[PDB]
Amino acid sequence: LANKFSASTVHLEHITTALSCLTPFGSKDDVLIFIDADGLSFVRENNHVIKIQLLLSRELFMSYSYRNETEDHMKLCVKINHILDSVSVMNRNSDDIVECTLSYDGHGSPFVLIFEDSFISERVEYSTYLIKDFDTNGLELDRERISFEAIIKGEALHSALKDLKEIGCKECYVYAKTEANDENVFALISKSQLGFSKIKLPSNRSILEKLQVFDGDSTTVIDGFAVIGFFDFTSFDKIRKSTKIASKVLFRMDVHGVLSVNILSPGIVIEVCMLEKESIDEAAQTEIELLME
Amino acid sequence: LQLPWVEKYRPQVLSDIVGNKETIDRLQQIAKDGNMPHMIISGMPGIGKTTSVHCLAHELLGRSYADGVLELNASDDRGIDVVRNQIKHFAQKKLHLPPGKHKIVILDEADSMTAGAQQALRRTMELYSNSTRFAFACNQSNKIIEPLQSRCAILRYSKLSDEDVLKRLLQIIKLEDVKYTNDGLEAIIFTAEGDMRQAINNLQSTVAGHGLVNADNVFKIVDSPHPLIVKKMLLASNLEDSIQILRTDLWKKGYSSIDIVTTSFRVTKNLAQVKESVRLEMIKEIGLTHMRILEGVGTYLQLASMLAKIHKLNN
Amino acid sequence: GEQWYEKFKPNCLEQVAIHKRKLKDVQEALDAMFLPNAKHRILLLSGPSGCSKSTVIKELSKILVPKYRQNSNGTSFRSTPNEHKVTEFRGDCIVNDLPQMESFSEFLKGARYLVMSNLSLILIEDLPNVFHIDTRRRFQQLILQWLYSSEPLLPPLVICITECEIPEND
Amino acid sequence: SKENLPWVEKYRPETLDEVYGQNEVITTVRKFVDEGKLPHLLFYGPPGTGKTSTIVALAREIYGKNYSNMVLELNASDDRGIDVVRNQIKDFASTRQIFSKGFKLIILDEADAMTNAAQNALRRVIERYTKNTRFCVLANYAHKLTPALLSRCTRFRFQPLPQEAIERRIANVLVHEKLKLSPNAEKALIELSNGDMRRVLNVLQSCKATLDNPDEDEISDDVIYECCGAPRPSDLKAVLKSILEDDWGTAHYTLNKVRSAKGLALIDLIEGIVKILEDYELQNEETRVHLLTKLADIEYSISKGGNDQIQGSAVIGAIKASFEN
Amino acid sequence: MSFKATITESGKQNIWFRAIYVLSTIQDDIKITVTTNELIAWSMNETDTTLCQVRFQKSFFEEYEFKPHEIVFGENGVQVIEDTYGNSHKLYSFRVNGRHLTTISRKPDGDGIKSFTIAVNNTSTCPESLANRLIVVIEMDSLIVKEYCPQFQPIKYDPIIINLKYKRRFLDVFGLDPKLLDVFTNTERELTSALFNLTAADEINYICCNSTLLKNFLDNCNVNVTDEVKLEINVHRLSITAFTKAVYGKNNDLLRNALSMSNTISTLDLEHYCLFTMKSIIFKLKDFKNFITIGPSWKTTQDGNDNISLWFCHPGDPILMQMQKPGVKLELVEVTDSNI
Ligand SMILES: Nc1ncnc2c1ncn2[C@@H]1O[C@H](COP(=O)(O)OP(=O)(O)OP(O)(O)=S)[C@@H](O)[C@H]1O
Ligand SMILES: Nc1ncnc2c1ncn2[C@@H]1O[C@H](COP(=O)(O)OP(=O)(O)OP(O)(O)=S)[C@@H](O)[C@H]1O
Ligand SMILES: Nc1ncnc2c1ncn2[C@@H]1O[C@H](COP(=O)(O)OP(=O)(O)OP(O)(O)=S)[C@@H](O)[C@H]1O
Ligand SMILES: [Mg+2]
Ligand SMILES: [Mg+2]
Ligand SMILES: [Mg+2]
8 A cells, every 4th residue: 555554454353452451541541553564552651650552463464564764663642532432333333344454654644444344444534643752661661670570370360350359459469479399479468448358379380380589680589588569459450451361461570669561362462561659558568467477 | 868857857756846835735645644535626737736646646556556547638538438438447446455545537637528528427426436536637627517526625726936936946957957047047937927837948948058047048048928018018108118018029029919919908807906997998999909900900000009099098 | 535425424304404495395296296196297306516406305215115115915026125215317327239329218118117016216317418419309209208108107207407507618 | 843933932941051030049949959859849920930941940950851751740731620639649649760760750830720629639648758759839829829738838939030131041042043132122122021031032033023134134122112013112201291291182182193103002001101100209199199090990991992082081181180289 | 266167069158148148238237146056147227127147057167166265355245145954155246347248258250169268366366457357268269369357346146036936926826737747846846946945916827938939929029119018818829919109299299109019829839828817917028039039049959948937926016037948047037017
């Protein structure tokens, strides 16, 4: 095509899945679209405290053309409510839709979404907006100062998130500890109306594939030390939709209080970065210690 | 980093709180006795109400402060549902405390609570007064509904005197090893107008700015309270003097006309020397000028005309 | 650390701080209400905070309910005589299977049965959240239905409203 | 890209060294950041004195060029109700820094537009999280701020811009552009600025536009008056002289001619005459009272429209009657 | 561990959750009494017009331990009851938020539960924070473990004896199909094992009916509109009617619309019916509608008889209702209309 970027596919599950994953970040706000030869990424940020990035790779599209030469990537911003409404009306007859193509022609042009059916094609153009000065790359995991890492199965994490949500969890604490004889302890401690509750993942290579505590440098493994991360549930719960489709989840917390969740569902890959609370109260610390001991 | 002096030197104990000596002594008596009743603490900003209530709770509950105190303020959710669930569950909690000690529910800025929540608090206080006690903190005691006031002992804090402000300022200076002069401390106290939070903020700003707290150095950053300037302007016996004050001391310093007229109304409300007829006529003229300003004509000419009319009223 | 206003609370009607004429009027009104076919179904008491409305109502109930309650035919919940002379509505009660606005509706639907051998005085001091418009409308509808109810037997219903001004709130 | 911007935004200070006319405040804040002891700040002042520019420059100095990542800026164009304070501001203030870059900064520009409930909610947010966060409030009207918020903040007053700072900024703009300004033109520009740099920049841009050949033409006071359509001092002096010395017919004719020569507005003439009379030495004080009252009434009436000729005759008659005392 | 018990079977967990949910619907706070032989979860509404009680025998739990002598904190809940034979029995009673317990005890939509343990620790070696908290440990089939410690307040227990008196009166009046004799013997055994002991005043009426028909009829009964239930029984039929009376306003304006829906069951269909020689009784429907759905939650094939027993004497007098399961006893007492 004559467009700078044009990607067409026959699977409509990827688009709706990505939109559903992005929904928990606000039904009426902005979404950033990054376009490059590797693929197309959707980025959202909330309150400068949490960030989500969902990547659709080149393999997911039956055809993918990126003819831009001056710039190696293209950045645009759209309103999520517009896309949500347009797709909801256009996707009412989900059985008949056969092709879906995205297109873009550089700055100053709309983002074009076309649903192609057997004999009817629907074309919608989304207006673009200036990108806010805030840089989404600011909230990133310092890969040289990982406090701990863990690999978890998607279903168990999704069940834990559902349990936390249903009890009206208000504060969450991620507790990670390692010992000898391959003893691992990964737990989520919730402060809610019920008081203090705990959800502990088993130390087996089917729900907790691996767990490591690196003493805040990613190199030296230390046993007997416990890493505790304090988060507000309003931001922690925003990964529930992503975990619903997730096949594997990788938690990585650094010393700067940044937690990164890598969700793997050819596929959809999601990155969620969140900041930790300023500090933990004495009562919360005492309750957590009593729960874990 | 280093905390600002206002938060760094917040008292931890009742003994370090100055001003309202009788009230603080009563609070210390309650703290050392234990039988704390429902209480309301009212007063102007920055005089130690929050500090006093928190210190009293800490001293009363000792190690049990974490599990025996429930603190809520205007920045938290405090609707009727909160009263129905969180406060109710806290008051129902069975906590073993030393004899004469009770759980404390601190409601800072209680005046802002909604009517429904305040009405709901009545039954909670009636049912759980045996093991729970409420400490309301507010600026306007009348903003708490009468049924709640009926159960509480009232405690009104007065504005701090220059002596107590000077004493605590000297303590802070001794702790910080700050070089100063007497005139500088007098200027700081004069500008504070009885608000100690402002006094400490201005002291820190002056110490940073020049290191030595002099009157000239204090007045370089901190300005004299504009209400006193407005009072001097209004009480001037000559129209020329009033106009000169309005120009040099208020208009040329960037004070907005709306602020000037509002301050003029507030000051005129408390002019004891003037007669009642003159006072009400001045209030009428100030109100007319305020109405003109609100329409968009916020000019120096309107303020000058208001001053001229006030002077006519005086004659 | 017992509070004096509770420690020295009245233990009989004679110690209630109430004007004699007002006490006589209230007692006569309630006694008439306790009749089998009493003309009055709701006694509404209004006044400022802490004027002995609920206190006098409870003290009068302690005498009136035993006088008019029918003796049970050897039937009762527990062994004790079930001293529940006053049945009070709780505005903070929340149950699983009931919307909030319906709570009061449920209470009355139970209170209707407290007659004859189960006689009890219904007292409404902790009102529902009448600041909510829909809740207030439902409350008024329920009060009207109680007033216009065709049930031959109803218990005396006393509503105590403490009148106060709502301070201006931001 | 900066070339296409209006001069008011093109010349926005980027560093604290570029903010003029606020030496005391600027020195205090610079040394505060040098010592890393920034308290909660309030910047109170009239329009166009450098409050927003100063706070943005301070944020840049504190956080270098990545201030946008650890600075939360909110203004009147955004909703700032009590829900916003409870959720967004609270969550930002209670979270750790991006890379442990000291403390976070929250800027509440035009905070006088916030509601009382939101301001009340802000008190404990400011107090509790002082260690991790610092608040900056900016305002033109202090009466809209609650006493508690004022008590919690260290106050700094941005005065109307002094003449020397305006001259230095004008010289900087003139060297930046290829523009020439006459001393009388600069004096008139400062006089009409009223301590607002935005007005100076806008009028200078309009004057440059007015020049047929800006590469060589010099801006004179006449160019400034043409661009602003304001009366000259000579016109005001002539009108006042005619009012105070000539008869009613002569004064009416003089006013009409002076106004019709350049299409001057009556309100501008009234303001100029008021400024002139403020320096007059009056031996009778009732004259000042009558002048002020009647001229304020005429200004208020003009603000709502009305008949222009009747208003001009009213000005003439008011001045004559006041000076007849 | 002052007290501990565990539930493993899926049906047992279902019935436990259903009982807790129903009790939570009755009152905001549920009362739990622990004894050496059973656990009693009960609730009474604000108007004192309805009482519900579910007794789980110690055999209902895979593991059961009760050590009253070890309780130190919250001793106000410890009670001693003297038996008629000269025996002392220890009890521990407390109050717990019903909604919280219901939320804790529900089965997750996706993952099943392998074990559900409830325990109380008020012994000497108990941290001050953990005092007066009910420990709930839930094991998931995926080896995930969940822990909750909701707060509880110790209280005193006042046994309700209405059922015992009704049973004694029924035995005296009506005490031949072998099932009737078996019922009489079971009632006598229950009365004897309990810790406590032809005029018109001795009226008593008993109805044993298969709860399937009642549940089927009630499924269509919306309590939000039909808030009254009337039972009319004669020697030929039994009719259950969900109804509501009309209310007329000032000018005969319909403030509330009357409604009625009735169902009739032949006396042959009913398991048992004994009358004091057309009885009628009226009471509230919501509590009965919720109560009738607890027993079926287990669905035990062996000795499967979802029969509900009802006892009623006179208008105004309480109506008693009982259901049984291999290790569960469900009782509901309601206040009846005094008219006529
Ligand atoms: N009496 C006092 N003695 C010593 N320091 C004081 C006193 N009053 C105020 N301060 C200082 O000011 C700070 C704020 O005091 P607070 O008690 O929080 O103010 P406040 O009286 O609660 O005003 P409001 O109602 O909250 S606006 C304290 O942390 C102290 O540093
Ligand atoms: N002699 C007394 N007479 C009346 N009340 C007394 C007396 N001594 C103590 N009290 C207590 O004083 C309180 C005031 O009486 P109430 O009847 O509760 O007030 P009120 O008129 O109902 O207004 P509200 O709605 O409760 S604020 C009650 O808690 C009484 O128990
Ligand atoms: N002190 C100053 N030094 C240099 N330029 C200034 C100064 N103050 C204002 N300006 C100019 O005027 C423009 C507007 O300045 P601002 O700081 O945004 O005005 P302000 O003080 O925020 O007034 P308000 O309250 O927003 S109406 C800047 O971009 C500069 O071009
Ligand atoms: Mg305070
Ligand atoms: Mg009362
Ligand atoms: Mg600004």
